Design a protein around this ligand. Structure first.
Ligand SMILES: OC[C@H]1O[C@@H](O)[C@H](O)[C@@H](O)[C@@H]1O
Ligand SMILES: OC[C@H]1O[C@@H](O)[C@H](O)[C@@H](O)[C@@H]1O
Ligand SMILES: OC[C@H]1O[C@@H](O)[C@H](O)[C@@H](O)[C@@H]1O
Ligand SMILES: OC[C@H]1O[C@@H](O)[C@H](O)[C@@H](O)[C@@H]1O
Lengths: 447, 448, 448, 447
């Protein structure tokens, strides 16, 4: 049987810059992605988030779609620069009003709104003050958090602080593939620390003025052994430490992983103890974003982890080049349960896959059998995790809509709903239809 | 008998924001609990308010020139919380902060050491509406406020006081209701005292994180002497001593709350979580003593809540506030304090002075206050005596630089070494200020 | 002259939690502001407290049997917020809720309609430490508390009161400090009044979302009659009337705040955001009137803050609380109220009664209170007169079922139609109770 | 600091039947404990007071022991049956001669003799006349008192009348665990009343023929709240009334506690006014016997107070099952000071603890660290009480010797001097050594 526990929450997820469009509309400020996406060479095919899914204007239709998919929850992000154009100071009434209407529309539809404070779109005005390199950001973020905490008190009960610190730092400051496009280990170390601090500050502020549950959202990519060679095991631990333990360990009060000292070398720093007290501020829940695993081997020229993944040719790969391997989800869920002591309620805040779909519907249909396969096998893997005692409270499919996959542009479709970006026409994919059955039957359809 | 003071011993004078500044609603400044309290009938003598006071907000330059004439090496002042952060939390008021920026730059330019106090009784009304010192979150609020100053005046203001006289704040503000916010409750008093201590600790920690220099609290102490050899009177003495002098000092030294408080506050007394005391005992760099007089408590079964009352010591002179003049008790207190802090904590007398009657205007360009002069020389000599007994005393601040608003007692109580004509805002240096200027210049040698 | 009352007209009696229950911190129950207030010396007459009161928490079954002997069709009571939610927010106290569960089931079993009041002056102290009625969040806090009750007693308690007498709460608790929490401030009074109204609105909305039945607020009104033809006396009358009778009623009816308040509170008066008034005017199903007397105000320039004072009406009897006995003013008030509510809102007299001297013990099994009997008969007749004049009046509750704690005036003021011997907790039905029982039985015909 | 007031008297206490032995020797009459202890089932292990500490023969050795301990006072009781064999009538010359020798020996040693008239050993001939149920005992006792008052005039200056009325009545008449082994509430009420009357009569007689100071000795066991349940507070007040206020209140002229009407029900009685005038005869001092506190909860089947103590597992317990909790001593002293108006000089006539000791010394030593701990903490608690204005004039350790703990036999050792009951060998315990140091330094050893 695959019936899920009582109260288990099924939903789907999005992010502001990836779907909203209208980036400068109605008072909204400039974000780092406004700058980044309009700089030549940064984005595939020169794609930008200027229009995206036009969600800012078509959110009502999108909610009708959520209802057709039988969604019980919708996880979304709030654009900081849309709400506070300069990052600090005067609030933008219309910008806040958008999310106000959105949340009311969701509650009317019977859909639980899951809000994320930061999904990679820092206000440019704050980037001009150093962004995540400026320790004061811990306060800025907190204040920003407060604006929402008070505005949606009693309506938004489940809060995420930061979405994937590792992507923000590794993509934004270490390798520069993401906004703000810096490439520096020194900056990567500092930015990671201040992201954690910002999370802690926001949680404290939430304790003072908020109502409900708050937590961080981490992505994890489990690193499997390439061989029994010791240099490869050392490589595996470097990669695992840099990607999976960098943020989790200090969040659990265990400090930074020792291996980071080797990974970042002269760029590594010692931080004040009270910083770690702030960072480990107790949370109510944790989100896991999960897609795949990796099999790292030693790679002396790979900066900075000196490791590289070994291609697992025995399995299918997504268009983002990610191995399809459902058991590794179960394992990860087990592992995380151990790291949090079984004491912290967990939720899969993102899971999904990118495969090729045509740019238009084919007489009113999009047939994506591999996305369907991914969905069913990984959800079964969730059931396996719950059977092993992991406290899993919910599952959010990434993503509700085909959207802007950041620097990879619109070429990577993660949606269970197809978006024709020429016409903004939405078409429910076979995967969405199937997910609607999984929700409807509460998992029994997998039988 | 020589009376030259140690090298580097700092001479100065002290004030507080609401008592001298005026312009309480000016340039974005928020409403404080004293704006409300002073504008409620019956609370203040003669209906006096801090609306104008010494008009210091406008006349600070003149006041600095006066500091120069007095040869002051230090000026101890407080920052109005609501002037800088009108709602207590949130948005900063640029002009309000700019005032203190101007003041500090002006002091440093004059060669005067600025000694800043974060809290001198003027809580933002917006925070009082959220429970004030009864709300534990105030510990955080204060810290944030502290941070704003710590960063703004980093490298300029090196000596920081967190809270000025927790006992006056709580006993006056929450226990008996003679001071803002005018509550009268033992239940509220214990909680308020606890959260005042917590706020101090939080501020010291925040200072360790973001600040530069030395930080400490300022306590008032009124030594309790035996009225008789009767045992109920000694029990009374220890109750009064516990409620006034040990309530805050003991947990600050990591010694927990005085046991006698359980008897003083009875059912209103509470046990608090262990980590609170860890926060409260956060190590400081220095401590300020506010000292004026002693008391001689006797048993008084109907006196709530300490069941004690002072015996009038008619053998000695008394001030306009009714405080006995008795300099040896200063020396004793300093010694006592040195012992309570283990001799390891550098001390400074952050307030000492006396109130006597002065006319409302100068008399041919003069104010003759021989009793204030007497108080001054005898108590400064007492400081020297304390130093000779091994007390690590680093400085002395006269209360006060200016005749000002003595809170609920209004303008009727003059503590200034500089006379203020409140009709014309004209300043006239008193004989006491004059003498003090000579004490500073001779570094104490004038007393010989 | 017949005095038969309308079909379905509901006869009952009323109490309040802190005034009768005792066991105030028992079985998990939290500390309330009255726990603190009553145990501070000087606040209560003879040092009386609500620690024991009528011991109703333990003797509620006996009291129900007493209700049955009086032929009561309804019992109006309040729920102690801190008994049900000890910290005001957060965890529910199962035993505390279980008490009211048993009480309500017992009432329904006896055929007696339970009329429940959410707030009768006993705020949890933990919420007072967060600013109490000065903190806007209380509107939410109250709502959540309301929900707990609405759902627990869904289908059992069909008639709900939100707030009992906003004016006594604010004027007594925040303006003059005669009631808990004992603040004295016009600034605080204005803010507190606004937040009480907001809390009422929030509770009504929450009731619409999760509740079942009819909900409304309970106002006290003291009609102000002319003292003379002097225009300053009429201005005085209008000030007093605005501050006491129109302050809350007008915004509840969507008319905004009385203009005269701008004059009454001066610099303490504030403008509030427009949406607050949308919240305050949330449509209700019924309204309660608490009524005892009238006043005849004259100009009094030194009377803070209404600058008015009542003229003693020596031509009429006065109760032991010093209130004039004048039944026609009840009729007038009801008519007035009917006019202010457009005749559209069902009204109920939720409190009416009188305090006269009774001995502390029964005298051969009896308590003879002919003046209380007189008050009862004349004012009930006045109710009938009011109905004849078109007031949509659905019921009448005698204050009070039991001799109880008259707050700051202690046990010295007996309002009961049932005598309580506070030495022994023995109940004895007074002559007034006997007469009221006959009034209910004959549905008014005894008045013929 | 812990220096005690000048003239503060340090000593130790015993009781006749618990240490003397030779109970019917040298003309001595039969006491109720002679009968009770020789009836099967009454005493643990069948222990009796036939030998005990053989003090009747070894008192000189015991005085040398007092001197080694630096005792300034020795509190002891006189066996009524040893002095007046039939309780009334002829005096027994030898029996009185023993206490004469003892008192002279003590005064010779510089030790202040503190004499107790009655310590639970009523003459059997008087028990056959109804004992404490016969009102005439008030007179009998007076006569007995007179015999001592006149014999030791000028030598014994501090007199106790009755030792612990509550134990006598509750143990002897209510529950029957002590001699004379009655179990009756009716009898308990009557006996309590006549004990109080006997005290008064003895005080009057002392006024007529005696010299010095006279007073009663009460045991108090302060009752603390078990919960916020009202039935438990009613329980607390019942227990408090029956144990702590039953005797103190009429002694202070306040009549009997109202709660007794509830406790004893139909067995409760109203007594003549003049009885209460006799009972309240002004005294010169009062003794407090103190050991522990109790935390009573409601217990409907517990006769007659319908209360029972709740085990306080957070604290140490003695071998008698008594919680170790020194602050309750301080509180009690204050309470007593208040009940007596602060005008009546108080003395702790008994305080101590029972812990396991081996039956023989090792090596010529007894290491009793918990008894030492009890000693230091409770003496410190006395100091705390003095600091709060309580007029406390002295402290007597129970007990000088390991002895017969009545019905619990010799299994409960209270001595600061160990007694090997096989050999009558005395060994001063570590507690005795420490106490000797406390006396010598007048408290300075505590700091
Ligand atoms: O890369 C695919 C997805 O990865 C997730 O971890 C990020 O949160 C999304 O913003 C992104 O679209
Ligand atoms: O109350 C008398 C004076 O002494 C101290 O308590 C305060 O610091 C002064 O501001 C106050 O005016
Ligand atoms: O002031 C007398 C009475 O006023 C009423 O309106 C309140 O509801 C009662 O609690 C109070 O006893
Ligand atoms: O129970 C231990 C001790 O208790 C005391 O109160 C009695 O007076 C002693 O005789 C007894 O040995």
């Amino acid at each position: 049987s695959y019936r899920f526990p009582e109260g288990f929450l099924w939903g789907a997820a999005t992010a502001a810059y990836q779907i909203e469009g209208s980036s400068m509309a109605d008072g909204a400020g400039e974000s780092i992605w406004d700058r980044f996406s309009h700089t030549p060479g940064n984005m595939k095919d020169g794609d930008t988030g200027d229009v995206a899914c036009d969600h800012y204007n078509r959110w009502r239709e999108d909610i009708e779609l959520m209802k057709r998919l039988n969604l019980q929850a919708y996880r979304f992000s709030v654009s900081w620069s849309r709400v506070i154009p300069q990052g600090r100071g005067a609030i933008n009434p219309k910008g806040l009003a958008f999310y106000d209407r959105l949340v009311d529309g969701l509650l009317e539809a019977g859909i639980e709104p899951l809000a994320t404070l930061y999904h990679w779109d820092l206000p440019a005005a704050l980037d001009d003050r150093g962004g995540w390199l400026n320790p004061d950001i811990a306060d800025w973020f907190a204040d920003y958090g407060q604006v929402l905490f008070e505005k949606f008190k009693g309506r938004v009960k489940t809060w995420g602080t930061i979405n994937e610190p590792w992507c923000i730092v590794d993509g934004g400051y270490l390798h520069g593939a993401l906004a703000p496009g810096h490439r520096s280990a020194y900056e990567a170390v500092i930015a990671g620390h201040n992201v954690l601090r910002a999370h802690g500050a926001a949680v404290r502020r939430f304790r003072e003025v908020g109502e409900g549950q708050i937590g961080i959202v981490l992505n994890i990519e489990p690193k499997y052994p390439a061989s029994d060679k010791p240099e490869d095991e050392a490589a595996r631990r470097r990669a695992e430490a840099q990607m999976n333990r960098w943020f989790l360990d200090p969040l659990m009060g265990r400090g930074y992983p020792e291996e980071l000292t080797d990974v970042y070398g002269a760029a590594w720093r010692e931080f004040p103890k009270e910083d770690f007290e702030l960072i480990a501020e107790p949370t109510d829940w944790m989100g896991l974003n999960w897609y795949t695993r990796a099999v790292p081997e030693n790679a002396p020229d790979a900066w900075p982890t000196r490791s590289r993944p070994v291609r697992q040719t025995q399995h299918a790969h997504t268009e983002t080049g990610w191995e399809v391997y459902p058991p590794a989800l179960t394992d990860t869920l087990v592992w995380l349960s151990e790291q949090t002591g079984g004491k912290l309620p967990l939720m899969v805040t993102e899971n999904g896959s990118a495969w090729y779909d045509p740019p238009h519907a084919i007489d009113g249909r999009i047939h994506d059998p591999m996305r369907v396969h991914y969905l069913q096998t990984h959800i079964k893997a969730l059931h396996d995790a719950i059977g092993k005692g992991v406290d899993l409270r919910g599952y959010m499919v990434w993503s509700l809509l085909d959207n802007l996959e950041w620097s990879l542009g619109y070429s990577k479709r993660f949606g269970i709903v197809h978006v024709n970006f020429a016409t903004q026409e939405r078409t429910i994919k076979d995967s969405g239809l199937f997910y609607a059955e999984v929700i409807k039957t509460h998992g029994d359809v997998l039988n």
